[PDB]
Amino acid sequence: KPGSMYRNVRQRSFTRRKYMGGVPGSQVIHYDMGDKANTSFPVKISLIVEEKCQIRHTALEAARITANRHLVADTGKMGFYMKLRVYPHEVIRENKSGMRRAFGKNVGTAARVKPMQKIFTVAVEKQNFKAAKEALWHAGQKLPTPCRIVVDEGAELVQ
């Protein structure tokens, strides 16, 4: 089931789970990676999507896995802090007959993100800026939107 199905935003939100029934649980396990009790990381880069889209929980999990693997391999187990900012709140549904009673059944969850919205933020030391940049580039390849990396803190510390 391709991500192009539940990708475009054409509809209102579908998030009130007390008026629906049976939502499959999200695949994304953690939302904070690296060293969670460190705040004195001078450089902080984030990945912002540049289109209004819906990101499925499986896409978020895939991007998170790839970025976390790259960061752990390059900077080490606690050489970085990584935050997945958005939670999949939207419930995705599918119509599984034809068009009669076509209101779908819940098949997953997605995060409805806006243009220029931060998806992932990574904090590292000065020497790991390019590694964090590379990891976030790999993470954005798993997402259904074009992305761009921005430096939030420590711009003068990289160039």
User: What is the contact surface with RNA in residues (CB under 7 A)?
Assistant: 2, 4-6, 8-21, 30-32, 36-37, 83, 85-87, 89, 93-95, 97-104, 111-114, 117-118, 133, 137, 140-141, 146-149, 159
Q: In what order do the strands lie in the sheet with 53-56?
A: 53-56, 105-113, 90-94
Contact (Cβ atoms closer than 8 angstroms) between residue 114 and residue 139: no
Q: What 8-state DSSP symbol labels residue 127?
A: G
Give the nearest distance from C-beta 3 to RNA in angstroms: 8
We find the least distance from the C-beta atom of residue 110 to RNA, in angstroms, to be 11
Shortest Cβ 121–RNA spacing (Å): 8
Q: Least distance to RNA from the beta carbon of 76, Å?
A: 18
Q: Which two structure tokens, joined as six digits, stand for 55?
A: 């990101």
Nearer to RNA, 2 or 156 (CB): 2
CA–CA–CA angle 16, 21, 23 (5° rounding):
80
Task: Considering the complex, state which of residue 9 and residue 65 has its C-beta at the smaller distance from RNA.
Answer: 9
Nearer to RNA, 23 or 75 (CB): 23
Which residue do the tokens 């034809």 mark?
98
Q: Is the dihedral of CA 144, 148, 152, 154 positive or negative?
A: positive
Among residues 64 and 75, whose Cβ is nearest to RNA?
Answer: 64
